[PDB]
Amino acid sequence: VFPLPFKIAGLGRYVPADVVLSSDLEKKYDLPPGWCVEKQGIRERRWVKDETASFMGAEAAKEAVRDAGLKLEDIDLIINASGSPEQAVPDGGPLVQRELGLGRSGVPSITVNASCLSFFVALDVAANYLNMRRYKRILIVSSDISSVALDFRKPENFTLFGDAAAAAVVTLPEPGEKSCIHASQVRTYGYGAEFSMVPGGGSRRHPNGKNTTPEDNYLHMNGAELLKIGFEYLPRFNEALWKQCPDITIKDCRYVIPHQPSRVVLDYLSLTYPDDKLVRIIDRFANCIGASMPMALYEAVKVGGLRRGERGVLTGTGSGVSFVGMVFTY
Amino acid sequence: VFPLPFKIAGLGRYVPADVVLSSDLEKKYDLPPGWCVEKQGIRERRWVKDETASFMGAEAAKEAVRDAGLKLEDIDLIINASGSPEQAVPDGGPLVQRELGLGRSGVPSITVNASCLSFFVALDVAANYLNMRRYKRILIVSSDISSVALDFRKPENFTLFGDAAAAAVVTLPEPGEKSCIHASQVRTYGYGAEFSMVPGGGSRRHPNGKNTTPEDNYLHMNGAELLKIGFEYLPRFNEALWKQCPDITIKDCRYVIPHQPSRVVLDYLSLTYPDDKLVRIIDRFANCIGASMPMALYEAVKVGGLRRGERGVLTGTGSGVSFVGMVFTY
Ligand code: NA
Ligand code: NA
């Protein structure tokens, strides 16, 4: 089954233009100077002005299409892979298709939803479409506006979240090119659903029904219990991932590219690997939910200079709870 | 590329136990006797008591797993493919995994979202995973509770919607078995997004923001404009679908199995094909959104007696606007 031919042909990003410095948030909301950097690992973030999520996604997508040496008309499948919805109906796929000027194109546009790990799962889905020769040039878009959830009474909230979009065009590699996936794995532990969830926003606690509570529209998080899921199941997850590519180990990989919704994953990695192995975006873009991993992938290539033939590792933990990992040659 | 080996190994359904007769709705809400059957094509529907969407999905899934001759522990991927969310976070995949008692299993559980055509797109995604030998035994679950959207001031609304879940287990066929996909196609016309949409429920019109209006949480529908998308693009859609399987035509197919959110698609088909070719569920289960197509697939096999080696056609139009079609040997 592995290795799977797979080429990240183009990458794109959109972030809002206005930088919100942690130092200015601290001055405005009476936090100690340096609090955000120490507690959150966040020095800056970007918040939207009037952008919609589809607008940001389309901007990132256009950059990725240019980067791939393609025109918009060459894309034959669009996958929206964001951490949060723009609206209830339709899904984000058709909305970004419309925003791209492709609304009359017929190009299928769908959503893959694995919460904040949607981008990862979309890559995996796309890899299978490509190798089955179903589609040739697949656009994956992850765009999130988390600044809508900002509560300026709560420092743990309002200093954490940022807005961003990133996108990839994926294709099969050309003859001679080594681009491939060596290993890919997704596991889900739904017993952890209650430790990171928003119980409102759907049928179970519909606003017009009898099951509503005041706390329905807020993220319920139990960090201690989430970590326990990691303690119990991550070692075997990692073991099983690397068994897929026994010829390749972490020493053969230039960059670790994590979903990074908080500094914890980065701190874990920093105790393990040299700093130059780790791709960091939370410092300048904060927690951008579903866009975090693809933002880090963009960073690895467009700032970190990841070269064709070098290898990377995508990794993440997300609400669900799910774990993902992928070892690839760029 | 086609034909693609593909076996619908098991099918399952859950519907609420209490039948709501159109005749009783008409008596209670002062509608003419026979109004629902004439205007909607709906004689009965089922509405939940205390069920959650995950509960119904899990019930349908268990039936499908039994039908496939499997145990729950044999499933290696779960795809939630519903028309509406149970809650905001996490997605429905982990929630149905938990409901099935598989919360500690590690089995990846994700969501594919193409609005009311999610089940179709999940089948397509699953077919590619199966043929790439990534997973062997894939559960697809579509569960929707639309009765939460009921407005008893509006006959066009409250007589239309029903609750239901259906599920499929899909695998590769055994040696000698003819089960396959002859043709599959998805097209999206995002210019039609505004003609069937709910603008609230996400970041664009977040309740705490400045873009809210009173009508945000209601389905905006422009039926005339939706039909125009059909007039312009359906003929070429159908042409392109059947060109994938030039050896197979509609005469070679026993059943047409449509997504059926209203009587219109059924009326179109009834003018074209003998009644015994069409699989109808709206009459007894009403508009069950994302569950409509898989409910009809269940009906085709478990009531219509579709035999292995006979052929069917899945067809649908959904919010987006998207069109789907698949020609398969059962
Ligand atoms: Na850009
Ligand atoms: Na059942």
TrEMBL record, chains A, B:
Pfam families found in the cross-reference section: ACP_syn_III, ACP_syn_III_C
Residues of the Beta-ketoacyl-[acyl-carrier-protein] synthase III C-terminal domain: 248-329
Entry protein name: 3-oxoacyl-(Acyl-carrier-protein) synthase III
Annotated ranges, domain Beta-ketoacyl-[acyl-carrier-protein] synthase III N-terminal: 112-188
InterPro entries attached to this UniProt entry: ACP_syn_III_C, ACP_syn_III_N, Thiolase-like
GO process annotations (BP): fatty acid biosynthetic process; secondary metabolite biosynthetic process
Organism: Corallococcus coralloides (Myxococcus coralloides)
UniProt entry tagged with the keyword ATP-binding: no
Gene Ontology MF annotations: 3-oxoacyl-[acyl-carrier-protein] synthase activity
SUPFAM superfamilies in alphabetical order: Thiolase-like
Keywords: Acyltransferase, Transferase
In-chain residues carrying the UniProt-annotated modification Cysteine sulfinic acid (-SO2H): 116
